[PDB]
Design a protein around this ligand. Structure first.
Ligand SMILES: OC[C@H]1O[C@@](CO)(OC[C@@]2(OC[C@@]3(OC[C@@]4(O[C@H]5O[C@H](CO)[C@@H](O)[C@H](O)[C@H]5O)O[C@H](CO)[C@@H](O)[C@@H]4O)O[C@H](CO)[C@@H](O)[C@@H]3O)O[C@H](CO)[C@@H](O)[C@@H]2O)[C@@H](O)[C@@H]1O
Ligand SMILES: OC[C@H]1O[C@@](CO)(OC[C@@]2(OC[C@@]3(OC[C@@]4(O[C@H]5O[C@H](CO)[C@@H](O)[C@H](O)[C@H]5O)O[C@H](CO)[C@@H](O)[C@@H]4O)O[C@H](CO)[C@@H](O)[C@@H]3O)O[C@H](CO)[C@@H](O)[C@@H]2O)[C@@H](O)[C@@H]1O
Ligand SMILES: OC[C@H]1O[C@@](CO)(OC[C@@]2(OC[C@@]3(OC[C@@]4(O[C@H]5O[C@H](CO)[C@@H](O)[C@H](O)[C@H]5O)O[C@H](CO)[C@@H](O)[C@@H]4O)O[C@H](CO)[C@@H](O)[C@@H]3O)O[C@H](CO)[C@@H](O)[C@@H]2O)[C@@H](O)[C@@H]1O
Ligand SMILES: OC[C@H]1O[C@@](CO)(OC[C@@]2(OC[C@@]3(OC[C@@]4(O[C@H]5O[C@H](CO)[C@@H](O)[C@H](O)[C@H]5O)O[C@H](CO)[C@@H](O)[C@@H]4O)O[C@H](CO)[C@@H](O)[C@@H]3O)O[C@H](CO)[C@@H](O)[C@@H]2O)[C@@H](O)[C@@H]1O
Ligand SMILES: OC[C@H]1O[C@@]2(CO[C@]3(CO2)O[C@H](CO)[C@@H](O)[C@@H]3O)[C@@H](O)[C@@H]1O
Ligand SMILES: OC[C@H]1O[C@@]2(CO[C@]3(CO2)O[C@H](CO)[C@@H](O)[C@@H]3O)[C@@H](O)[C@@H]1O
Ligand SMILES: OC[C@H]1O[C@](O)(CO)[C@@H](O)[C@@H]1O
Lengths: 399, 393, 393
């Protein structure tokens, strides 16, 4: 069929894909549009990228639904370790597989911009665009990669439904993936590492599914940033280095069955009246020393809650930071800060820390329940408007 | 190798795949069987479907193990939204990618029937058939799509082992996926929406794995129906619109780490003595208005339990239905109905509701434990044969 | 591009891949090395294996980063059932899809050895090698398959980063997958069954991700074995027959949202000071009779803990073993054995058993908390140094 393209064998290209794969892909998209010319004759296409090192000089603009861009794998290599190592005898020093080196010279910072102008009720949304099994690489960057090199991998900037980002590698980018106005996006089985931020769901979103990923962005950005997100599902991910899942006015999220690790506070922040979110069956680990930052102090919380009726159940909170490195100096670090809101619920969580640490209930909070989720020594309730059923501990009395 | 076929380039096809891809696939299957003729020379084949709009007029019948049918993506477009919109200027109005329009003219309702004749002990089960990354579309349908247009995407009707349905799109079908007599089926990473039912595991099943899907079927059918299911695993799914997971004599299921939402009751129903099932670390949301139905009233439960020794832990039950729309009128809605059974266990669940709502223990139940899973006001126990450790209030 | 190879069509092959696919893949790798000759010109390659039956006689050695070897599916057929059946009329008797019959005659046990010698700081690690959607088969084996036929599917024996094993089938091997010194491996969506052991992470590992697999190895080995593992994530798996997840000096693991079943003790063993590991939202089922062993007796535990500060929350422990088969004879079997360690935490778990069964706290343990995770009758505390908040009875 004429809907199958390979960037290296398609003869209609006027530049080599090794020189500018962005120009080649744009030319393929123009070819698709010349063949798929009515609303009932636009099934889309597949563009295959074989293993190779490809420079991208021109931003790709996708306004075609059902476009699949696929390669041979995620191609990750730790450029951060490379850049701290003596690499003269390394067998390879670049990420690989189907490897796009993001090198725009066109005044734009995105390798891929997925965007259609118009009112969605009038022109239709972008639907079921698929990025699978290729590598996007910013080539050179320094920690924490934000602002860094300013480069973005994939950015969706118009309303979209059922998009799919699967099996990819993203490395050395300021922003790996940005999706504005996402409805039911599927972000799964990716390897995002050594980037400023990993996933940003901007504007608003409905029922995003973020599953089975490695998310390894650093401490200036977010692993998952979600603005006005309804119904987010975040599960089965390994989120490392500077795990930071921030919801701003997000509700009815399900954040379950993840491995979550940071060298910094704010592993989950439910901000700006984020309510009825579940945080269940996750392992949280806070450590120190893989980078340092004062973006947050240790009173911010491993989990920070500003909202109502959230549920924190069945998790482990494991904290190991040397006392001399805790901030503000001399203070007890915070495991969960319930900063504001009503009827939040913590139950059946185990808190293990190298120094005394606290669940803090701000004086403004109401009806918070803390049920086998803190010993007496682990609760710092700044209002009497809470219910405590303590995790058992000894020495209630002094004599 | 000659085991790789593309429906648009295979020279043996006597019909265009755009006109009837079902006939083309059946011709390929006949070719495979002509070349793979003994029990040690049947490795199977791959059929690739490039992006395109393909009509299916003839049901495909598969009795070949290790057949992979694969395309370029799930291809979903909301035909429900399209059908309530003014679409003259829409850039596209059809689902796409590798897009099969299910339009049988042969009197059958399935696009794909996977079925082998004979006793499995004598002829073997069907093994490791793979459907990946294509779109099955019923073309025209009206809510709630059941009975709807009567169309079925894929139906497995004989005993099978290790089948795999991955990365697919299904839309505007009465039944997206039906698997009878499945052992270790893998149903993962799919997008099933605007269908009557999404997944039906019929007859019986053993250790089915249903993970990482979007399931968005409507209120007359089931998101997941499984009868005589041993060991079902359901995790990592986003199940929306009319989430309804019904187990009929299902035991030892693990239903965990899902996002579950419905505009109707019966988000999970453990029916016909379904026992020793785990429901843990799920977010449940009940809302109202995206369709209406009287199939269940609000006393049925967001979770409904008829069975023994089930375990409900670490979930949120979030309920928001205007009082004037609650049924029966004026009555307190039910979060969990323990309808019958012994030694069921509810612990460490948070119930948040816009009106007073209850966990109801039917008078026939025995030894139910409700442990930090309901305040006193949230328990309506109709038998003293239970144990309550109240969520404080 | 010349970085794409098919073992059945590549013109450089001097051996048939059906006779020795190992030789053909080794020849492809030599070709890759001849074309990709500097540290900035080694993007790797893809090797496609179409459906077919291929013997492997020569071990493949991979020391090239970013090599993908991919086929048409997992190809599983239950050879165990075949070998106890009358198969004269079976339509197929062999696993299929892209099917490698592991038949080494070169003095080695592995089909694939992934190894780069010499110091990772000097030569680099092996990075992002991908095995996808093919079948590795030991051809003939007898239960429990370990030591069995001695055959290994894939063995990584040098430090590696971001490797990926996805969608594969492994059957009738002593060891399906071994990875030594793994950093962020991704082992996902596989079907590993009727093998001695399924996944072994040796030496040490960091942040392995094991998700969405069927793991069906038998009772002499391990479903998942990990030594010196930091941060292992195990979730969404269906682990059957002889589920045994053993961590030796493993810490900060997250073992959640799995369906876990064994006919034997030791479904999870946290051994040799394994600490701060989470076991949450899993369904555990212990049954008897699908094979028998005296490797462990029933006092070992469904879960066995030797370490500190672990967390066991929101699970079901379902135990069904006839009293006549429980060992030591006449003794109550153990659900969770806290063998040694400090500050372990059990909360909101439901224990259901056909006979009296216990959480046992060894006399050496300190500060164990057991909170709505055992009735009084289900706790056998052999030290007064614990906290009990009983499940009501
Ligand atoms: O548009 C076609 C069709 O899509 C449907 C499918 O259900 O969804 C609409 C869609 O776009 C909505 C859009 O604006 C939503 C908006 O509100 C959010 O944020 C508010 C707080 O400010 C919340 O109170 C509110 O509940 C949320 O919806 O987002 C803006 C920023 O907040 C608000 O000004 C809007 O009212 O979302 C994007 C990103 O903001 C905008 O471009 C859209 O107008 O929803 C998804 C994104 O979630 C998108 O794919 C859809 O087009 C249906 O409603 C429409 O008929
Ligand atoms: O970290 C930078 C630097 O700023 C300070 C002072 O702003 O702390 C900021 C930080 O922690 C503040 C903390 O307590 C704030 C406190 O006061 C709030 O409430 C009062 C009314 O009850 C108001 O008068 C006041 O304006 C508000 O800030 O909250 C407690 C009552 O709940 C009071 O005892 C405190 O004075 O916030 C939490 C409680 O929410 C405490 O644990 C903290 O001490 O802000 C973030 C948390 O949001 C944390 O990371 C920062 O330390 C100074 O303390 C720091 O050196
Ligand atoms: O250091 C920067 C930063 O990078 C991270 C990212 O994960 O680590 C990458 C790094 O890991 C080392 C590596 O090998 C460690 C090795 O030895 C360990 O285990 C032994 C047995 O317990 C101990 O004797 C030894 O002390 C431990 O370090 O693990 C292999 C198996 O034992 C041995 O062959 C290795 O020497 O860790 C993984 C395995 O867990 C391997 O893939 C790695 O090589 O890798 C680079 C290159 O080697 C090295 O600089 C880093 O430590 C993170 O941990 C750090 O914060
Ligand atoms: O081959 C089976 C055969 O071996 C025996 C020998 O006892 O059991 C081994 C087995 O269970 C042992 C079990 O109890 C051990 C016990 O003693 C330990 O602690 C004492 C100090 O407190 C030491 O004097 C003694 O040497 C240590 O072994 O532990 C209890 C105190 O915690 C004592 O009452 C017991 O005598 O281990 C657990 C407790 O950890 C009990 O439930 C068991 O009875 O070892 C594994 C468990 O690690 C289990 O599978 C085996 O049965 C004999 O009992 C069997 O016939
Ligand atoms: O394993 C994937 C690779 O991701 C890492 C994780 O650790 C980081 C980021 O990428 O590496 C730098 C080393 O400078 C650390 O600061 C940061 O954690 C690689 O380390 C790892 O090998
Ligand atoms: O009439 C619109 C119908 O479509 C819905 C909502 O939209 C879908 C499918 O069914 O579901 C998600 C919403 O997030 C979208 O991907 C997809 O279009 C029904 O809920 C609604 O009745
Ligand atoms: O499925 C509906 C379609 O199927 C047919 O009955 C046979 O192909 C068409 O006449 C009709 O439009």
């Amino acid at each position: 069929a004429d809907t199958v393209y390979d960037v290296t064998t398609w003869a209609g290209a006027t530049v080599s894909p090794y020189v500018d794969i962005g120009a080649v892909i744009n030319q393929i998209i123009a070819d698709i549009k010349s063949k798929q010319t009515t609303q009932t004759t636009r099934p889309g296409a597949v563009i295959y990228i074989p293993p190779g090192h490809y420079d991208l000089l021109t931003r790709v603009v996708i306004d075609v639904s059902f476009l699949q861009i696929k390669g041979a794998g995620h191609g990750f290599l730790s450029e951060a370790i490379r850049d701290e190592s003596q690499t003269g005898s390394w067998v390879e020093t670049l990420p690989g597989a189907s490897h796009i080196r993001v090198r725009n010279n066109d005044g734009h910072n995105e390798a891929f911009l997925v965007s259609r102008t118009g009112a969605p009720a009038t022109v239709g949304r972008l639907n079921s665009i698929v990025f699978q099994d290729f590598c996007l690489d910013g080539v050179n960057a320094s920690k924490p990669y934000l602002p860094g090199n300013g480069k973005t991998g994939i950015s969706f900037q118009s309303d979209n439904d059922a998009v799919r980002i699967e099996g990819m590698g993203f490395v050395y980018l300021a922003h790996a993936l940005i999706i504005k106005g996402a409805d039911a996006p599927n972000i799964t089985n990716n390897f995002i590492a050594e980037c400023g931020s990993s996933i940003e769901l901007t504007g608003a979103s409905q029922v995003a599914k973020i599953t089975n990923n490695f998310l390894i962005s650093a401490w200036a950005g977010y692993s998952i940033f979600a603005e006005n997100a309804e119904g987010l599902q975040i599960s089965g991910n390994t989120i490392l280095w500077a795990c930071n899942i921030t919801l701003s006015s997000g509700n009815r999220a399900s954040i379950t069955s993840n491995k979550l690790l940071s060298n910094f506070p704010s592993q989950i922040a439910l901000l700006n009246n984020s309510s009825e979110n579940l945080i269940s069956a996750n392992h949280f680990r806070r450590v120190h020393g893989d980078g340092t930052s004062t973006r947050f102090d240790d009173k911010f919380g491993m989990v920070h809650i500003a909202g109502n009726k959230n549920t924190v159940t069945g998790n482990q909170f494991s904290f190991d930071v040397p006392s001399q490195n805790i901030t503000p100096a001399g203070q007890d670090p915070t495991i969960v800060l319930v900063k504001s809101g009503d009827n939040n619920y913590l139950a059946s969580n185990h808190i293990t820390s190298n120094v005394a640490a606290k669940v803090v209930l701000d004086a403004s909070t109401t009806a918070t329940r803390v049920l086998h989720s803190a010993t007496t020594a682990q609760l710092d309730a700044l209002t009497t408007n809470h219910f405590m059923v303590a995790t058992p501990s000894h020495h209630h009395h002094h004599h």
